[PDB]
Amino acid sequence: LGTSKAAARIRAAAIEVFAAKGYGATTTREIAASLDMSPGAVYPHYKTKESLLYAISLEGHHSVLAAITAADFPDIAAPDRLMSTVTAYVTWHADNRASARVGQYELRSLSPEHFAIIADIRRSTTKVFTRIIEAGATAGDFHPFDIEAAALAITSLGIDVSRWFPSHTYSDPRIIAARYVELALRMVGCAD
Amino acid sequence: TSKAAARIRAAAIEVFAAKGYGATTTREIAASLDMSPGAVYPHYKTKESLLYAISLEGHHSVLAAITAADFPDIAAPDRLMSTVTAYVTWHADNRASARVGQYELRSLSPEHFAIIADIRRSTTKVFTRIIEAGATAGDFHPFDIEAAALAITSLGIDVSRWFPSHTYSDPRIIAARYVELALRMVGCAD
């Protein structure tokens, strides 16, 4: 993706602006201006709006993938793996909700090459959960009705956190993750 | 009940879903119906009021749907099955409207937001009231009733984002799968 704090700063500002004015209505000029720069100050980093959205979406998709992957430990029991990855997944989605929304909701705006790369990262994200669920089935820890349905439901819950969070009940990521951990274990038919 | 207002809502749903809410003006929505300039204003004085009327309609509709699918005098697992099925199917069947009514709540005014949240709470209540009846009758052994009802509601809403996918393109199949998950969630046997 790159490493420039200058680019990172443009992406952060674009997220805020994309969230405020809508992606289709905002221009890079809004963004560079909001950062007190000349409109051409973004061009070195992002030649097009779409390039900037792709950077945001890639960053976000890779980050949540990196998060749950680092949270998975194939040397521990499957239920513990599921607690850990669900915790990291839900927490990520609460903490990075603004970036997550921009990444998720504007996929229709990505070029074909960029869309195919993002979809591939999304497939990998789900597969982290399916592997864990499979592992537990193999060990007799889990008794899923349907492994793919279970992985979908879990990925779906984490992603939707970025929409509704924070609520009056759930404003602490740790509390929502704990609740969703209990439900995920129940979903895959693990003992309590 | 105005024909002109109803058409504005329908057209806005599609433009809002296609271009994103922030990215569209009421001018473009008037343009899309080839209505003359200013035809929108007597019905919707702001873009936000149109968003509000769309969200309000969609929220009343899904609540009506799951309410009609609940039967307070029958066993709780059956109520859960009937209501989740209706909830999932509505979301698959009304996805454009759901997407608009659910994914832009931060664009609503405080007054409007809280009105909508009153309806969502009523929506979640249908599920919590059923999980409560199930626990208090011995069918269910939930860890946390609010948490389970939240997760059910969130699963259904999220259908409007992803459906149809490679894995599910028939609303009845994803409904069936989500009924299984919801029953498991609340501690039902099987």
Side-chain angles (χ1 to χ4, degrees), chain A residues 2-15 17-20 22-28 30-46 48-103 105-112 114-122 124-126 128-130 132-147 149-192, chain B residues 1-18 20-26 28-120 122-124 126-128 130-190:
Chain A
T3 148
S4 174
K5 280 284 159 206
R9 178 170 173 273
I10 292 155
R11 298 199 298 283
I15 286 155
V17 175
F18 288 162
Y23 175 81
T26 135
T27 180
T28 77
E30 328 260 284
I31 303 169
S34 74
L35 291 177
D36 298 301
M37 299 179 305
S38 55
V42 175
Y43 192 74
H45 296 102
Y46 303 105
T48 75
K49 219 213 316 216
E50 186 276 346
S51 78
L52 173 53
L53 171 72
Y54 171 60
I56 291 164
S57 184
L58 179 67
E59 173 167 53
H61 288 270
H62 173 277
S63 172
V64 73
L65 177 57
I68 62 170
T69 299
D72 191 33
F73 303 103
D75 58 2
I76 65 182
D80 297 296
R81 295 176 62 183
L82 193 66
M83 293 171 38
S84 184
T85 53
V86 173
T87 302
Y89 189 64
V90 168
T91 304
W92 190 97
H93 272 285
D95 292 344
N96 303 282
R97 58 194 181 271
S99 178
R101 282 183 258 119
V102 170
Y105 303 173
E106 318 278 8
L107 291 161
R108 66 181 165 234
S109 286
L110 294 178
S111 78
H114 294 157
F115 186 80
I117 289 162
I118 295 301
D120 185 56
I121 301 163
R122 286 153 82 86
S124 294
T125 301
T126 301
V128 173
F129 290 113
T130 60
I132 287 152
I133 299 170
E134 285 172 5
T138 72
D141 293 325
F142 292 163
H143 313 285
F145 278 106
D146 183 310
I147 296 173
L152 162 69
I154 286 158
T155 58
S156 167
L157 289 169
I159 287 161
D160 195 65
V161 160
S162 296
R163 185 185 56 78
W164 61 262
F165 182 94
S167 70
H168 294 293
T169 312
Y170 304 108
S171 57
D172 179 342
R174 297 164 320 187
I175 298 175
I176 185 57
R179 250 71 282 160
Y180 274 12
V181 165
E182 290 156 3
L183 294 158
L185 291 167
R186 281 272 185 99
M187 273 184 266
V188 299
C190 188
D192 301 346
Chain B
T1 34
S2 157
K3 195 174 155 174
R7 292 173 171 201
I8 288 165
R9 287 198 302 286
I13 279 163
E14 296 300 312
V15 188
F16 285 161
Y21 170 80
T24 117
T25 63
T26 60
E28 295 157 351
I29 296 155
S32 68
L33 289 172
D34 200 26
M35 283 165 110
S36 41
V40 174
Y41 186 91
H43 306 96
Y44 304 102
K45 308 208 176 324
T46 60
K47 193 175 64 164
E48 188 283 343
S49 76
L50 173 49
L51 181 65
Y52 169 68
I54 293 163
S55 195
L56 169 69
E57 184 166 40
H59 285 259
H60 278 303
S61 174
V62 74
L63 174 69
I66 72 176
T67 300
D70 189 26
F71 305 89
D73 289 344
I74 84 169
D78 306 316
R79 298 166 73 186
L80 194 60
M81 290 176 110
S82 178
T83 51
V84 173
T85 301
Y87 193 63
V88 171
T89 294
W90 189 95
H91 280 284
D93 283 352
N94 293 277
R95 48 196 194 252
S97 169
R99 262 190 279 250
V100 176
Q102 217 76 66
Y103 285 77
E104 311 284 352
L105 293 160
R106 289 175 178 89
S107 295
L108 295 173
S109 71
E111 198 169 74
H112 291 143
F113 180 92
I115 296 316
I116 303 307
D118 284 331
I119 301 154
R120 313 200 324 245
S122 298
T123 306
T124 300
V126 174
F127 294 117
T128 67
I130 289 151
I131 296 154
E132 282 169 344
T136 100
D139 299 299
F140 302 152
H141 297 80
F143 272 111
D144 184 309
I145 293 181
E146 168 166 15
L150 160 71
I152 289 158
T153 52
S154 162
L155 279 172
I157 286 165
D158 193 57
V159 162
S160 296
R161 177 190 57 88
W162 63 261
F163 184 93
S165 63
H166 175 69
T167 157
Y168 306 98
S169 50
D170 181 344
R172 317 260 280 156
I173 305 190
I174 185 60
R177 299 292 74 79
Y178 271 5
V179 163
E180 290 169 345
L181 293 172
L183 290 161
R184 280 274 180 96
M185 272 189 250
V186 299
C188 213
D190 305 44

